[PDB]
Symmetry: D2
Subunit: 113 residues, 4 copies
Amino acid sequence: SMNEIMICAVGNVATTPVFRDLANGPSVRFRLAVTARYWDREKNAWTDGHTNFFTVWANRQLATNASGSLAVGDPVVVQGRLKVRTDVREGQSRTSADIDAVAIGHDLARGTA
Amino acid sequence: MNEIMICAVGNVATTPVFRDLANGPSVRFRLAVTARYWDREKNAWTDGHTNFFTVWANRQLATNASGSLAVGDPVVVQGRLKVRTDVREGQSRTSADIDAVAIGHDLAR
Amino acid sequence: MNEIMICAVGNVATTPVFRDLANGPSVRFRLAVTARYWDKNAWTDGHTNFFTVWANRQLATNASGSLAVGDPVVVQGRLKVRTDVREGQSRTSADIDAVAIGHDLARG
Amino acid sequence: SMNEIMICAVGNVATTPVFRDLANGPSVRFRLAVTARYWDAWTDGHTNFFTVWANRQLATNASGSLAVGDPVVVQGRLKVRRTSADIDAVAIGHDLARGT
């Protein structure tokens, strides 16, 4: 394969993951919230910037393992292929971002193992 | 900081638009990044999904891009990915944007 | 600012070394990232990239307590190529200053 | 193909590109200097050096287009290796963001 766009996204599980057994095998999907932060001089702390939302998809053993491990609020690191999609929702054409995950882990920077 | 960086190799898909804003020069263009896969039952590369991005540049990058980029040009773009749902200009309120740090004509193609 | 970000999926290759400094906790460990290619009718190992991974603050504390040799991990951080010339003889090594580390749910 | 480490490096050509006649075909290599900068105006931090390799049309084009000092964007596969950090380049371009 060529010219896939890889992404690594560090964020929080934003929806309860959904597991489905398909003919092609196990599948899991969840929403991931990735919030950029910037250092404020006027407040002397980190302040939230833009939040990117992604729909994260996993398959095979990653799906099976994720289905037992991930819950809303969990800080995670996700690596995978970015897919920018256009679809109709509430009768409007809208662009959205999917990550076809290759690796997912609970982020040790923001929680214990 | 938790910005999502992206490096995208694709083609300029729309004629770039240059705008002089109060904040300085700005350029935007659409970038088409098409994945390809090797076909065994045929010979060559076959096209998969195309990711479309709106690429934004400012300052010197905008000034230089405005004189250099045209539809069809193969380019390499590095920048910050912004998946947007509150766009207040143009005809769509959603976008997948790249706020470009670096852009170059791709010498591979 | 021109930092080079990297995301590496590999295995912990050395026991992490944890140091409690006055400036805060620090940890380092070696990470092995092995490329694989299809076909023997399976995956075969290609080149292994070795990195020294560094972390600080809560990430150092948490990684120290949870990582052991062999563990599959995903690491995101800043790549630093360290080049040390002595007597015209140059020793290069690749460091990752980690922002995020997790046990990889794909392989465990 | 699995678990290759991609990277995108934005830096300056540090050595004149040179030709290598490999068994896999004609190739070009050059040294790339990637210097992080931090705001105080900008001050230089650590410089990462890579050996960048290209083949086929990318090599031919790079050989005719690149010179020492040129700001460039390089995308490719990182190979940490006599030791070195190599990038097997997929895309190289002159960076429109910068001046020599």
